[PDB]
Amino acid sequence: MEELSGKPLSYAEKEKLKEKLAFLKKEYSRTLARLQRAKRAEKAKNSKKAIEDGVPQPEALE
Amino acid sequence: MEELSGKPLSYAEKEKLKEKLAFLKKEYSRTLARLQRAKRAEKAKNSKKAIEDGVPQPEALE
Numbered sequence: 001m002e003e004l005s006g007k008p009l010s011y012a013e014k015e016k017l018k019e020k021l022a023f024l025k026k027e028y029s030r031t032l033a034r035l036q037r038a039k040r041a042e043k044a045k046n047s048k049k050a051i052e053d054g055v056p057q058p059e060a061l062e
Numbered sequence: 063m064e065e066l067s068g069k070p071l072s073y074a075e076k077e078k079l080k081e082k083l084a085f086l087k088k089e090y091s092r093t094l095a096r097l098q099r100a101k102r103a104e105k106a107k108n109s110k111k112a113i114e115d116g117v118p119q120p121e122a123l124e
Binding site: 007008009014017018020021024025027028031032034035037038039043044045046 | 068069070071076079080082083086087089090093094096097100101106107108
């Protein structure tokens, strides 16, 4: 994948390019949407709970 | 490509997401730009030509 400024893009190069633009576009809209619903709303920010769970030894270097 | 609801994205999930948005964004601008300069201008489509450039045999081996 070398950025070569010269020869025109071929048919197949245009195909992979237009589906590139549409792929990154459709995912951008969806994944940015959910990113905003996470960070802006803060509905499930993980408030300071009772840390007493089934927590094991993180490493235990003797 | 999974879809986990309830709790939001983690710190590292937000990191990979924001760099995702910025990655696809910067490339989109650049690669769409050159796509337009190719197709709209038509400065070089490689016009109608003779096959005499040392054309390879399609299946003339047998």
